[PDB]
Design a protein around this ligand. Structure first.
Ligand code: HEM
Ligand code: HEM
Lengths: 212, 213
């Protein structure tokens, strides 16, 4: 489980799915053997592409991911590893200068999703190639420029042996939406207004604008 | 090696890892879950030892300062001398093969990461807790802030202090992923760098690519 103070809960389950879709390069964590620090790999993870219809909740759905099979994290997972995948969205430092109140302390507004469950390794070549093609389809659509993978499928197949594809059955899903909900209404407005004025912070202002 | 980093994605200089830690202080702190559970992950503000003089070129051997909420189960979970990783995530951008203008190809994600490992030591004294949060204001307000003066709030910090869980992390191992199209042919790296220079969202990635030898 993930610690999320009451005020930082998403208004709706759909916000956690939106952050996963918007920020697919997750930090995949699993336990380190013999009391060592956890293993951490940045990996591209998407929602099950076979899910037709609105996906409102992460709990009960399967995420699809891959990493490098030669990455020692792949061997360390073994068979039924309990893992967390952390998705990190828009974030910005909050200067109390923005509050125009006193006294105060600074903070950092940020967005995260933590999904936990059992990681199963894909061994099937068909399921592995489906994983990377669904990942092209999902990320090129949201982040890309209309690139057509069709002419590169032979190439995908040539490099496929190196792919460690996986499936993560989401047992638990938690979302930090730390967006100044602890402040009084006028101060939340001052913060939202200050973040509206620059590209680095507009995405945070966007989420703050959608709070009930 | 505790973090997997293909040879092409090694930083040019140890200083690049220190730069990313300074630029991206909101780290993800990870420690093992009890009895096969998944790791505990908390976003925590972390800075370089403010007492360091000289140029800081290497993370290994320096102490990082940070805090978290004592009310967070992760605080009780860390117990004594917990082995932890703190991951710092810098500039990043999806790479469309449309930018490469080459075939065949596969998309990728250019990103920067630093993973530091060592033993987390808790600070229990109020005087070391207070130092931790004051040092953190001085380091972050200067770099990310808008000229706020903490002077008027110094007693306020003491009046809201018990909830702070301050810690020290002596860096035993530091690894850095600088995934910035080094695997592509030079003409293609240039195409990605020029593409990423044409939008604010991707400019920081272009800037790192421009600083590669
Ligand atoms: C669509 C976007 C994609 C992204 C963001 C992406 C991202 C990544 C990342 C971050 C890793 C490294 C994980 C680790 O450190 O262990 C990786 C490894 C790998 N991916 Fe993907 N991938 C994508 C599509 C593909 C496709 C379509 C293929 C086709 C087969 C592929 C083949 C590989 C291979 C072979 C590796 C092992 C490392 C290597 O030889 O380059 N990826 N991918
Ligand atoms: C300068 C930038 C600062 C940042 C970016 C920052 C960030 C954070 C974050 C992310 C947490 C939550 C950690 C968790 O989930 O366990 C935290 C907790 C906390 N911080 Fe800070 N902090 C800052 C400065 C301060 C200062 C100056 C104080 C003064 C006492 C302070 C007091 C606290 C307290 C009491 C908590 C416990 C939970 C709460 O009451 O919000 N912080 N801080």
């Amino acid at each position: 489980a993930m610690f999320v103070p009451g005020p930082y809960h998403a208004p709706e389950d759909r916000w956690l799915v939106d952050l996963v879709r918007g920020h697919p390069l997750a930090q995949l964590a699993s336990n380190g053997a013999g009391g060592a620090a956890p293993h951490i790999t940045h990996v591209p993870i998407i929602v099950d592409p076979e899910l037709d219809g609105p996906v409102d909740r992460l709990v009960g759905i399967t995420l699809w991911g891959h990493m490098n099979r030669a990455n020692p994290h792949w061997a360390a997972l073994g068979g039924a590893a309990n893992v967390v995948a952390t998705f990190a969205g828009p974030n910005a430092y909050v200067s109390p200068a923005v509050y125009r109140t006193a006294p105060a302390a600074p903070t950092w507004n940020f967005t995260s999703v933590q999904v936990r469950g059992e990681l199963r390794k894909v061994e099937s070549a068909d399921d592995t190639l489906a994983t990377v093609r669904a990942t092209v389809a999902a990320l090129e659509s949201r982040f890309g420029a209309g690139w057509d993978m069709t002419g590169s499928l032979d190439y995908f197949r040539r490099i496929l042996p190196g792919v460690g594809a996986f499936r993560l059955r989401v047992a638990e899903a938690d979302g930090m939406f730390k967006l100044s909900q602890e402040q009084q209404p006028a101060i939340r407005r001052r913060v939202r207004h200050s973040f509206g004025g620059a590209e680095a912070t507009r995405a945070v202002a966007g989420l703050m604008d959608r709070l009930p």
